[PDB]
Design a binder for this molecule. Structure first.
Ligand code: NA
Lengths: 33, 293
């Protein structure tokens, strides 16, 4: 139908401002078709 | 110009404590401006994009949060990206931010896209940080080279003919998408008019149509203006940035418009998460949040 939809809430990537971007606290949830 | 070496260096602080600077040579940064400017000019000022892609709001020189967003979204070219503007000013590392984004533009010119925000403007970033940063780390000559690059940025994008993307918002002058295409580049941002509004205007639930904007520039617009605009052009969603939103994204007018802001803990002054809008090939839009502890 080619139309905008919105998915459910996704768990966010939780980060510590003092940790390297390499070291996230929690991996945020990925979107799935 | 070794684009690969430039990208490798900017990405070297992915495993480093925040605060570490990447200082490219002045000639390499000039090369990043000149070649990206060339690519911006060669591509339409109103981008016609295809999903899937992830859409990002203001970064504002917060470079390590940009890397954290790529850590979540996927580093180029694992995902396609559209940024809505405001790469410089306010943050501590506008130089590393814009150089990585311009390098990514040169590297994947058909998979990485950057719109113009109101801070990609000489009058604005002169006073809000980027000019001072160019001046102490390099020189004023480099800042002027950036201005000639920013003057060539595109100002809007439409994804799958259904999502209208710009930094600020609508304009009372925007009657035909042709009007955006006729805008010639390089150009500065005027104090009024079509191009000004697209970088500067804001939605407002308390305005009926078009109203005063207390930024001293442009307008505010109401939910009815949004709905009339989407029906007239057969679009489903307006995607803009330009304002701090606590949850990193915020809807307006029964989800007909969404505001994205992608710099968490903005300036160390606000309590906000950062968000991207991930759009799959079916145009199902999800918000990936970058949330601080
Ligand atoms: Na179009």
């Amino acid at each position: 139908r080619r139309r905008v939809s919105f998915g459910g809430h996704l768990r966010p990537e939780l980060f510590d401002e003092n940790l390297p971007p390499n070291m996230p606290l929690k991996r945020g949830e990925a979107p799935t078709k | 110009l070794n684009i690969d070496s430039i990208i490798q260096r900017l990405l070297e602080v992915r495993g480093s404590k925040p605060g570490k600077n990447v200082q490219l040579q002045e000639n390499e940064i000039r090369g990043l401006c000149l070649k990206s400017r060339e690519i911006f000019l060669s591509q339409p000022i109103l981008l016609e994009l295809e999903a899937p892609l992830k859409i990002c709001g203001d970064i504002h020189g917060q470079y390590y949060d940009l890397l954290r967003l790529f850590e979540y979204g996927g580093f180029p070219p694992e995902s396609n990206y559209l940024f809505l503007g405001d790469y410089v000013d306010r943050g501590k590392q506008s130089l590393e931010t814009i150089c990585l984004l311009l390098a990514y533009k040169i590297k994947y010119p058909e998979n990485f896209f950057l719109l113009r925000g109101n801070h990609e403007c000489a009058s604005i970033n002169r006073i809000y940080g980027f000019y001072d940063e160019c001046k102490r780390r390099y020189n004023i000559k480099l800042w002027k080279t950036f201005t000639d690059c920013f003057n060539c940025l595109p100002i809007a994008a439409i994804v799958d003919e259904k999502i209208f993307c710009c930094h600020g918002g609508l304009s009372p002058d925007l009657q035909s998408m042709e009007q955006i295409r006729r805008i010639m580049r390089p150009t500065d941002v005027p104090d009024q008019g079509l191009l000004c509004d697209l970088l500067w205007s804001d939605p407002d639930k308390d305005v009926l149509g078009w109203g005063e904007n207390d930024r001293g520039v442009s307008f505010t617009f109401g939910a009815e203006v949004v709905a009339k605009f989407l029906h007239k052009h057969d679009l489903d969603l307006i995607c803009r940035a330009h304002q701090v939103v606590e949850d990193g994204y915020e809807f307006f007018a029964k989800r007909q418009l969404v505001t994205l802001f992608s710099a968490p803990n903005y300036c160390g002054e606000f309590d906000n998460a950062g968000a991207m809008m991930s759009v799959d090939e079916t145009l199902m839009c999800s918000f990936q949040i970058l949330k601080p502890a």
